[PDB]
Amino acid sequence: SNRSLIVTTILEEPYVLFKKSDKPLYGNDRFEGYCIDLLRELSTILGFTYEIRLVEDGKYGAQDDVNGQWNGMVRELIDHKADLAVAPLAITYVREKVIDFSKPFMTLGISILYRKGTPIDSADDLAKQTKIEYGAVEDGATMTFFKKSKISTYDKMWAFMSSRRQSVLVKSNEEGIQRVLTSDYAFLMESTTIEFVTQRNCNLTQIGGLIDSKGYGVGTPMGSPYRDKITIAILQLQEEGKLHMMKEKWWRGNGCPE
Ligand SMILES: N[C@@H](CCC(=O)O)C(=O)O
């Protein structure tokens, strides 16, 4: 009996969410989304069975300053609590040092989610003031970007977020959106997710362009034999246009003027 691979992931629309149904759903059947469709394709292409498990601490993954320990999906892979991480997991150098990533299946960049009708046009507009608050998902790649950046504007922004951790860093992208809707707050979030949000909530918009550039990749414990096999599978899916169709399927946001 070939054991099923344990796949860690995280709730994040439209990548992974609880499928609605009139009757209860169990195990893998509970989930749907872009990353779920991606996982399904990987399993058939490589030929493996799996069991989906939501990351226990509900985090993507960041390293602690004192003990140097990681958390989130990154940590679950490091400790071999999961064979693969199939989620909107940003491929970053600091993460590549502890886990491996497949080639990216989607590209993106950090940008700003805010309301319409304001003169704000860039991160610089946010950095020079403190009336409009701003933050990012705690223990995620965006937070880490600002935490280590030496770029003047971003260093200042991290100084702002750091002293206000408990009030501006959020538990999820969903909460970040809620902050934008319930206070004078601008949220630093990935462009792909901003695209999804703004096509569904016409009160919101992206401010400025992409602050950086990265991709999402499937994560595996360092040294895993599946990493290269998954990379090939992703390139195949890309070539035949399936990744494109999958994006269109889940980002279906025929709403909000642009
Ligand atoms: N996708 C990000 C989480 C969200 C964010 O940091 O903006 C990550 O892999 O950590």
Swiss-Prot record:
UniProt-annotated glycosylation sites, renumbered to this chain: 2, 203
Disulfide bond annotation, renumbered to this chain: 202-256
Subcellular localization: Cell membrane; Postsynaptic cell membrane
Domain of life: Eukaryota
Description of post-translational modifications: Sumoylation mediates kainate receptor-mediated endocytosis and regulates synaptic transmission. Sumoylation is enhanced by PIAS3 and desumoylated by SENP1. Ubiquitinated. Ubiquitination regulates the GRIK2 levels at the synapse by leading kainate receptor degradation through proteasome.
Entry comment describing in which tissues the protein is expressed: Highest expression is found in the olfactory lobe, piriform cortex, dentate gyrus, hippocampus, granular cell layer of the cerebellum, and in caudate-putamen.
Topological domains, Extracellular: 117-258
Residues given in the record as L-glutamate binding sites: 88, 90, 95, 141-142, 190
Summary of the function given for this chain in its UniProt record: Ionotropic glutamate receptor that functions as a cation-permeable ligand-gated ion channel, gated by L-glutamate and the glutamatergic agonist kainic acid. L-glutamate acts as an excitatory neurotransmitter at many synapses in the central nervous system. Binding of the excitatory neurotransmitter L-glutamate induces a conformation change, leading to the opening of the cation channel, and thereby converts the chemical signal to an electrical impulse. The receptor then desensitizes rapidly and enters a transient inactive state, characterized by the presence of bound agonist. Independent of its ionotropic glutamate receptor activity, acts as a thermoreceptor conferring sensitivity to cold temperatures. Functions in dorsal root ganglion neurons.
Family: Belongs to the glutamate-gated ion channel (TC 1.A.10.1) family. GRIK2 subfamily.
Quaternary structure note: Homotetramer and heterotetramer with GRIK5. Tetramers may be formed by the dimerization of dimers. Assembles into a kainate-gated homomeric channel that does not bind AMPA. Can form functional heteromeric receptors with GRIK4 and GRIK5. Can form functional heteromeric receptors with GRIK3. Interacts with DLG4. Interacts with NETO2. Interacts (via C-terminus) with KLHL17 (via kelch repeats); the interaction targets GRIK2 for degradation via ubiquitin-proteasome pathway.
Other facts: The postsynaptic actions of Glu are mediated by a variety of receptors that are named according to their selective agonists. This receptor binds domoate > kainate > quisqualate > glutamate. It does not bind AMPA without coexpression with GRIK5.
Protein name: Glutamate receptor ionotropic, kainate 2
Organism: Rattus norvegicus
Gene, per the UniProt record: Grik2
Residues of the full protein shown: 429 to 806 of 908
